[PDB]
Design an enzyme around this catalytic site. Structure first.
Site, PDB file in Angstrom:
ATOM      1  N   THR A  37       0.790  -1.101   0.020  1.00 25.58           N
ATOM      2  CA  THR A  37      -0.056  -0.125   0.062  1.00 25.58           C
ATOM      3  C   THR A  37       0.902   1.274  -0.073  1.00 25.58           C
ATOM      4  O   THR A  37       1.637   1.269   0.824  1.00 25.58           O
ATOM      5  CB  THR A  37      -0.717   0.028   1.303  1.00 25.58           C
ATOM      6  OG1 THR A  37      -2.011  -1.109   1.334  1.00 25.58           O
ATOM      7  CG2 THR A  37      -1.594   1.142   1.515  1.00 25.58           C
ATOM      8  N   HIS A 191      -6.042 -11.381   0.397  1.00 24.70           N
ATOM      9  CA  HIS A 191      -5.507 -11.079   1.545  1.00 24.70           C
ATOM     10  C   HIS A 191      -6.115 -11.557   2.847  1.00 24.70           C
ATOM     11  O   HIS A 191      -7.286 -10.941   3.169  1.00 24.70           O
ATOM     12  CB  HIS A 191      -5.450  -9.365   1.501  1.00 24.70           C
ATOM     13  CG  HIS A 191      -4.477  -8.754   2.622  1.00 24.70           C
ATOM     14  ND1 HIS A 191      -3.892  -9.533   3.495  1.00 24.70           N
ATOM     15  CD2 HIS A 191      -4.355  -7.510   2.618  1.00 24.70           C
ATOM     16  CE1 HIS A 191      -3.358  -8.583   4.159  1.00 24.70           C
ATOM     17  NE2 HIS A 191      -3.358  -7.380   3.900  1.00 24.70           N
ATOM     18  N   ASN A 194      -2.392  -9.916   8.392  1.00 32.36           N
ATOM     19  CA  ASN A 194      -2.132  -8.610   8.861  1.00 32.36           C
ATOM     20  C   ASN A 194      -3.391  -7.999   9.464  1.00 32.36           C
ATOM     21  O   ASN A 194      -3.279  -6.802   9.705  1.00 32.36           O
ATOM     22  CB  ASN A 194      -1.503  -7.453   7.670  1.00 32.36           C
ATOM     23  CG  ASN A 194      -0.337  -8.180   7.038  1.00 32.36           C
ATOM     24  OD1 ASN A 194       0.471  -8.867   7.484  1.00 32.36           O
ATOM     25  ND2 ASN A 194      -0.045  -7.746   5.661  1.00 32.36           N
ATOM     26  N   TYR A 196      -6.554  -7.778   8.708  1.00 36.57           N
ATOM     27  CA  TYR A 196      -7.701  -7.315   7.940  1.00 36.57           C
ATOM     28  C   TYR A 196      -9.016  -8.107   8.111  1.00 36.57           C
ATOM     29  O   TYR A 196      -8.956  -9.081   8.994  1.00 36.57           O
ATOM     30  CB  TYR A 196      -7.142  -6.878   6.706  1.00 36.57           C
ATOM     31  CG  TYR A 196      -6.016  -5.545   6.654  1.00 36.57           C
ATOM     32  CD1 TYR A 196      -6.656  -4.199   6.908  1.00 36.57           C
ATOM     33  CD2 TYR A 196      -4.732  -5.911   6.691  1.00 36.57           C
ATOM     34  CE1 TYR A 196      -5.830  -3.402   7.193  1.00 36.57           C
ATOM     35  CE2 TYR A 196      -3.866  -4.930   6.771  1.00 36.57           C
ATOM     36  CZ  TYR A 196      -4.363  -3.506   7.111  1.00 36.57           C
ATOM     37  OH  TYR A 196      -3.308  -2.525   7.365  1.00 36.57           O
ATOM     38  N   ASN A 251      -2.550  -4.762  13.616  1.00 41.13           N
ATOM     39  CA  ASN A 251      -4.120  -4.804  13.817  1.00 41.13           C
ATOM     40  C   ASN A 251      -4.750  -5.271  14.903  1.00 41.13           C
ATOM     41  O   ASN A 251      -5.817  -5.810  14.788  1.00 41.13           O
ATOM     42  CB  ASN A 251      -4.627  -4.978  12.351  1.00 41.13           C
ATOM     43  CG  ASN A 251      -4.450  -3.715  11.341  1.00 41.13           C
ATOM     44  OD1 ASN A 251      -4.253  -2.618  12.011  1.00 41.13           O
ATOM     45  ND2 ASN A 251      -4.358  -4.086  10.116  1.00 41.13           N
TER      46      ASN A 251
HETATM   47  C1  LIG Z   1       4.413   0.617   3.284  1.00 43.37           C
HETATM   48  C2  LIG Z   1       3.792  -0.724   3.536  1.00 43.37           C
HETATM   49  C3  LIG Z   1       2.583  -1.002   3.191  1.00 43.37           C
HETATM   50  C4  LIG Z   1       2.047  -2.250   2.966  1.00 43.37           C
HETATM   51  N1  LIG Z   1       0.911  -2.851   2.504  1.00 43.37           N
HETATM   52  C5  LIG Z   1       0.624  -4.099   2.312  1.00 43.37           C
HETATM   53  C6  LIG Z   1      -0.499  -4.549   1.611  1.00 43.37           C
HETATM   54  O1  LIG Z   1      -1.344  -3.603   0.978  1.00 43.37           O
HETATM   55  N2  LIG Z   1      -0.640  -5.695   1.756  1.00 43.37           N
HETATM   56  C7  LIG Z   1      -0.311  -6.666   2.436  1.00 43.37           C
HETATM   57  O2  LIG Z   1      -0.769  -7.933   2.493  1.00 43.37           O
HETATM   58  N3  LIG Z   1       1.055  -6.350   3.126  1.00 43.37           N
HETATM   59  C8  LIG Z   1       1.477  -4.926   3.178  1.00 43.37           C
HETATM   60  N4  LIG Z   1       2.481  -4.725   3.864  1.00 43.37           N
HETATM   61  C9  LIG Z   1       3.364  -5.831   4.208  1.00 43.37           C
HETATM   62  C10 LIG Z   1       4.410  -6.155   3.332  1.00 43.37           C
HETATM   63  O3  LIG Z   1       3.907  -6.946   2.304  1.00 43.37           O
HETATM   64  C11 LIG Z   1       5.472  -7.085   3.994  1.00 43.37           C
HETATM   65  O4  LIG Z   1       4.930  -8.462   4.368  1.00 43.37           O
HETATM   66  C12 LIG Z   1       6.343  -6.492   4.918  1.00 43.37           C
HETATM   67  O5  LIG Z   1       6.475  -5.097   4.749  1.00 43.37           O
HETATM   68  C13 LIG Z   1       7.499  -7.320   5.277  1.00 43.37           C
HETATM   69  O6  LIG Z   1       8.527  -7.336   4.403  1.00 43.37           O
HETATM   70  P1  LIG Z   1       9.695  -6.544   4.395  1.00 43.37           P
HETATM   71  O7  LIG Z   1      10.518  -6.430   5.704  1.00 43.37           O
HETATM   72  O8  LIG Z   1      10.493  -6.982   3.314  1.00 43.37           O
HETATM   73  O9  LIG Z   1       9.172  -5.092   4.173  1.00 43.37           O
HETATM   74  C14 LIG Z   1       2.989  -3.252   3.745  1.00 43.37           C
HETATM   75  C15 LIG Z   1       4.263  -3.130   4.487  1.00 43.37           C
HETATM   76  C16 LIG Z   1       4.550  -1.817   4.273  1.00 43.37           C
HETATM   77  C17 LIG Z   1       5.834  -1.215   4.939  1.00 43.37           C
HETATM   78  C1  LIG Z   2      -4.796  -3.012   2.075  1.00 44.64           C
HETATM   79  C2  LIG Z   2      -4.368  -2.215   2.892  1.00 44.64           C
HETATM   80  C3  LIG Z   2      -4.805  -0.574   2.546  1.00 44.64           C
HETATM   81  C4  LIG Z   2      -3.314  -2.273   3.804  1.00 44.64           C
HETATM   82  C5  LIG Z   2      -2.400  -1.542   4.285  1.00 44.64           C
HETATM   83  C6  LIG Z   2      -1.082  -2.010   5.022  1.00 44.64           C
HETATM   84  C7  LIG Z   2      -1.084  -3.419   5.366  1.00 44.64           C
HETATM   85  C8  LIG Z   2       0.042  -4.074   6.086  1.00 44.64           C
HETATM   86  C9  LIG Z   2      -2.047  -4.228   4.766  1.00 44.64           C
HETATM   87  O1  LIG Z   2      -1.520  -5.559   4.706  1.00 44.64           O
HETATM   88  C10 LIG Z   2      -2.794  -3.815   3.869  1.00 44.64           C
END
Ligand SMILES: Cc1cc2nc3c(=O)[nH]c(=O)nc-3n(C[C@H](O)[C@H](O)[C@H](O)COP(=O)(O)O)c2cc1C
Ligand SMILES: C=C(C)c1ccc(C)c(O)c1
Ligand SMILES: Cc1cc2nc3c(=O)[nH]c(=O)nc-3n(C[C@H](O)[C@H](O)[C@H](O)COP(=O)(O)O)c2cc1C
Ligand SMILES: C=C(C)c1ccc(C)c(O)c1
Ligand SMILES: [Cl-]
Ligand SMILES: [Cl-]
Ligand SMILES: [Cl-]
Ligand SMILES: [Cl-]
Ligand SMILES: [Mg+2]
Ligand SMILES: [Mg+2]
Ligand SMILES: [Mg+2]
Ligand SMILES: [Mg+2]
Ligand code: NA
Ligand code: NA
Ligand code: NA
Ligand code: NA
Ligand code: NA
Ligand code: NA
Ligand code: NA
Ligand code: NA
Ligand code: NA
Ligand code: NA
EC number: 1.6.99.1
Lengths: 399, 399
Positions: A37, A191, A194, A196, A251
């Site tokens: 995101t 998804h 996390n 949700y 969350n």
């Molecule tokens: C800015 C940001 C946005 C993220 N958005 C999502 C998301 O849209 N969906 C999701 O399943 N995980 C999301 N995550 C989690 C990442 O996919 C990932 O699992 C997490 O950042 C750990 O991996 P990394 O250490 O390589 O960043 C987000 C993480 C960050 C930091």
């Molecule tokens: C889909 C949204 C907006 C979202 C944001 C942050 C995280 C970690 C995520 O898993 C999902």
């Protein structure tokens, strides 16, 4: 600048650089862009950013044969609640997604849409403004005090879904998946991680229901598996993956403090393998590692050492993508990818390194990320991070 | 003779030779004698062998500070069905057990009684002769064709337990545990492994019930956990362990072919950890490894490579005893015991090596076992296997 204290390692001699097929897609290497995101979608209408999103994805598709999972995309208005995250329900959204998918395909890479539903993580005031409910599994446990208070102030108290409302979400998942494929996506990721909505059903802290959707392992998994089955039926198992975060606490999920948590996720993995053995194997399972129990804490923080995701491999026999603090730990990746069905998701460092895959192969320095622009309505910190070549020209080898 | 092709390794430099406390007992090393049925008990009355059993256990207690788990012992007549396995329900049995426990204690070792209940593995004709039922979880799935046919010939068809009959077994477990402690045992092990009655309830192949004791993970685990709780209440958590064999197929259990099997066992482990965190931690969990899915197949046969027991360690945080083909694989033991709460059960090679612990410490040859006398009404192959010194005097270094 480059990350100062990092000692890179070239991973070109590992399975990270061996081809693998995921669903219909012949990946050329196993470094995956996990869903990230970024909050560049525009209001009203949750429209993927008309100025920058194509360029963002094009940059990150540059290594041929890369698997990209999009930022989470809301399946419907009711599934949303953040004004600057995109959806996949409307024509105006799909016009922009089509351009993004085309651009990724022109770079010989692949794109999977993550289908997102917020539940209790949504902002209740945005939902109230739009005439929408504030939804979760239950109505008597809340993400935190601030969310509960915002909901009450908005005259939008947290609502425990009825069975019919669960069915309506499932209809929306199906339509969102159809929309994604019709617009050119290679597949979708459900998804269920996390914290949700689907994870709110999986987790016994957030799910206090006493109907068939709560109160046991099988019941807590029911919604997730219904979405799996509905999407497999609609678009095919080869176009569907599932994301889970067994040890996550983001969350207000339980993580390892819940002694039943491994059993809960083992049950889901088993049900996926049962379907696979019966002829409908999902394209992949995507796991967030206990390395990162909250992705908004700096790497190394929020690490849970009391559990492993390795159990999943005893159960599910298909591809597994693992994500969480791997960019700074090539030594760990080198060991994990000895397993021949393991892929590695690199999140935060793909934000800051559009050419991350080259850097991983070649053992190059990594661009430091700027967390302040992770969520920001800007090209800055989105499409202006340099490739390694561009960073050298900026003198970053001496910054 | 010594095992011909075996290359021993001295394990004295590993945690196998570090002290550990299990329940009330200060073990001096981590090589455990797992439960080994030997069929020297005498009929009538399932009486521990009055001539040889003391000597058998004395021999195997010779290394100070060894944990011995007895051969399975029937908790009641109805729990039995093999004429030459012992019970722990009668005065005449306990007279002999007292002598055994005293002898083990004189050698500065410890003894835990395994509490056994056969279910569908029993011989229905022996049970019919004695006016007893042939019991299992269900009445519409059978261990094998021969057992089903024997039951019908004996006018003793397999019987699905009523809730009252389950309660009666629980009463018998409690009394058997009390008897064991009163006679001097250090604790008890609940046998919930190897396809015996409790495992018949855990496993969805053998448990087709639709009441609260079947039809879900929680329901299939209910009987096992009720026995755990009843024994913890009666004699204390520090005097109770539990044995499980997640990947076992012996006695027609499912093993890894059942995609839900890890979830089933993860649930049990989680429920034990929940009790532990609430102040009642069992002394240990004893796992049979997927290394040995059937203990009547030669080492190396019946190995399941598609699963690991490591998941248990993410869940249960207490001592874990692991058994299955470790005597011939010191290289595997060396790795497993790097975990500081892991003990190793050595079964078949403790049958043939009364001084196994010295042999493990010192890297000495192992006496070959004689499977033909595993079950036999004889001192031969029971109390006449030599120590290493005695084997040298017999010239086995040249046989
Ligand atoms: C800015 C940001 C946005 C993220 N958005 C999502 C998301 O849209 N969906 C999701 O399943 N995980 C999301 N995550 C989690 C990442 O996919 C990932 O699992 C997490 O950042 C750990 O991996 P990394 O250490 O390589 O960043 C987000 C993480 C960050 C930091
Ligand atoms: C889909 C949204 C907006 C979202 C944001 C942050 C995280 C970690 C995520 O898993 C999902
Ligand atoms: C002759 C024999 C008798 C056994 N009796 C029992 C028993 O009474 N209870 C039990 O839980 N396991 C029993 N087992 C299984 C062993 O405890 C052990 O798990 C198995 O033999 C694997 O370990 P090993 O390779 O070191 O022999 C028996 C195994 C054998 C070969
Ligand atoms: C208690 C009995 C008689 C027994 C026999 C063999 C095995 C493998 C076992 O687990 C138990
Ligand atoms: Cl830095
Ligand atoms: Cl917002
Ligand atoms: Cl031999
Ligand atoms: Cl018999
Ligand atoms: Mg209400
Ligand atoms: Mg700034
Ligand atoms: Mg009948
Ligand atoms: Mg012979
Ligand atoms: Na290197
Ligand atoms: Na611009
Ligand atoms: Na594994
Ligand atoms: Na924010
Ligand atoms: Na800058
Ligand atoms: Na040695
Ligand atoms: Na004799
Ligand atoms: Na572990
Ligand atoms: Na036999
Ligand atoms: Na002999």
């Amino acid at each position: 600048s480059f990350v100062k204290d990092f000692k890179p390692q070239a991973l070109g001699d590992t399975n990270l650089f061996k081809p693998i097929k995921i669903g219909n897609n012949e990946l050329l290497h196993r470094a995956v862009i996990p869903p990230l995101t970024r909050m560049r979608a525009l209001h009203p209408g949750n429209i993927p950013n008309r100025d920058w999103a194509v360029e963002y994805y094009t940059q990150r598709a540059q290594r041929p044969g890369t698997m990209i999972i999009t930022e989470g995309a809301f399946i419907s208005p009711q599934a949303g609640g953040y004004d600057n995250a995109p959806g996949v329900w409307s024509e105006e959204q799909m016009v922009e997604w089509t351009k993004i998918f085309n651009a990724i395909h022109e770079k010989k890479s692949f794109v999977w849409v993550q289908l997102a539903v917020l539940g209790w993580a949504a902002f209740p005031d945005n939902l109230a403004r739009d005439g929408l409910r504030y939804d979760s599994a239950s109505d008597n446990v809340f993400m935190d005090a601030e969310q509960e208070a915002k909901a009450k102030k908005a005259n939008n108290p947290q609502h425990s879904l009825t069975k019919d409302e669960i069915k309506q979400y499932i209809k929306e998942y199906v339509q969102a998946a159809k929309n994604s494929i019709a617009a050119g996506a290679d597949g979708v990721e459900i998804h269920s991680a996390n914290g949700y909505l689907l994870n709110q059903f999986l987790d016994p802290h957030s799910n206090t229901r006493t109907d068939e959707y709560g109160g046991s392992i099988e019941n807590r998994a029911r919604f997730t598996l219904e979405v799996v089955d509905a999407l497999v039926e609609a678009i095919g198992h080869e176009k569907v993956g599932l994301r889970l975060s067994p040890y996550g606490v983001f969350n207000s999920m339980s993580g390892g403090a819940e002694t039943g948590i491994v059993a809960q996720y083992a049950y889901v993995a088993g049900e996926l393998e049962k379907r696979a053995k019966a002829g409908k194997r999902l394209a992949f399972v995507h796991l967030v590692e206990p390395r990162v129990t909250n992705p908004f804490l700096t790497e190394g923080e929020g690490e849970y050492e009391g559990g492993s995701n390795d159990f999943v491999y005893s159960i599910w026999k298909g591809p597994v993508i693992r994500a969480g603090n791997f960019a700074l730990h090539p030594e760990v990746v080198r060991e994990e990818v000895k397993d021949k069905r393991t892929l590695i998701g690199y999140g935060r460092f793909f934000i800051s390194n559009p050419d991350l895959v080259d850097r991983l192969e070649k053992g190059l320095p990594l661009n430091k990320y700027d967390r302040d622009t992770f969520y920001q309505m800007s090209a800055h910190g989105y499409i202006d991070y340099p490739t390694y070549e561009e960073a050298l020209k900026l003198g970053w080898d001496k910054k």
